[PDB]
């Protein structure tokens, strides 16, 4: 070994050649989720009574699933030991003595980002060894630690996103300031705050896209905003529907680079997909038989400061995805379902988990809109996880009880 390259002397190395974060790991395809059987197959309990408030899931050879409760602690579980060795307890429990409010992945490592109420951001290395050609976890290490404290205003962390390739290595922190501060893994050095107008509410969502250039955000007020990250430059503002707040933005790779899911804005859909360059609604997937009008979905750019914020009105706006490829898994609190959506053929969609037989019906409003429709026949999911176990796709689900589902 040697540390000169690390001591910021000079300007990487990448991420790959900290050693403290293990080796970076082979990329592991989407989950083939069409397949999903929607059967139940364990019940796990060792959280109870404390809310899981962010779940995560490492895919590979020994997938494991990553818990975080509101007292702070943090699990790991073996996935392939509770489906085939029936084996219910975690193997690794770490204690960050703080309401955790988010587990982010550090792509490609066994490492994963731990935001708390108390302001701090810790990444943790999952170390591991081969017994009998079986992983055994080890230990969780912290390996990274950073105080948002540090920054002057008290803030902390409630949402994060990382991105890494070889070029790259970011995590980008949500505060509860709405603030948005975007540091090198490598060091946990600021590198950019982006700061939102309060004039469009608070901050309640975000993600990076593709090519981590743009931070799109969207607001209590149902605002979506799109930020050069390069340039701190506001790029894109726009409303729709009645702006219902945006609880979450997520990329849609299957569509192409510049599409992202949006959770919110209307209180009429599961969720719309929106192309951020044209400004332009390309689906929307209603949460009834009615159609809205076409007009529901066209984007208000002027006026934005002047929307009310209109609160959280219905089971409807709790939805949390897990997004795998060309399809989109999606909690539907008001029936006790999981939806499927197939981007690949919307009218396959269907509520994979569910107690009836709903049907999704696909039509083109526009030359440039499908509206899906949904025609009709336990505790509220904080997160949900999606991966496969030798091949066969599972579902994870994790609630505000302390209970997770294990689902084939």
Known sequence: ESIEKFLSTFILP???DYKEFGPIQEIVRSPNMGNLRGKLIATLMENEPNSITSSAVSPGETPYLITGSDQGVIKIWNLKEIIVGEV??????YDCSSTVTQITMIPNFDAFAVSSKDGQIIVLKVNHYQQESEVKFLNCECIRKINLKNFGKNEYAVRMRAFVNEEKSLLVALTNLSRVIIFDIRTLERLQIIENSPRHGAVSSICIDEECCVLILGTTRGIIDIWDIRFNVLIRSWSFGDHAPI???????????NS?????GSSKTFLTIWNFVKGHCQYAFINSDEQPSMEHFLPIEKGLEELNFCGIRSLNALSTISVSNDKILLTDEATSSIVMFSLNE???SKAVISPFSDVFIPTQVTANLTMLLRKMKHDIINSISTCEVDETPLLVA???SGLIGIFQ
């Open 14 to 16: 990448p991420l790959r």
């Open 88 to 93: 219910y307890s975690s193997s690794l429990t």
């Open 247 to 257: 609880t979450h933005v997520e990329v849609c790779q299957f569509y192409g680079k």
């Open 260 to 264: 992202v899911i949006v959770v919110g």
């Open 346 to 348: 919307l009218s396959s």
């Open 398 to 400: 994790c609630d505000n």
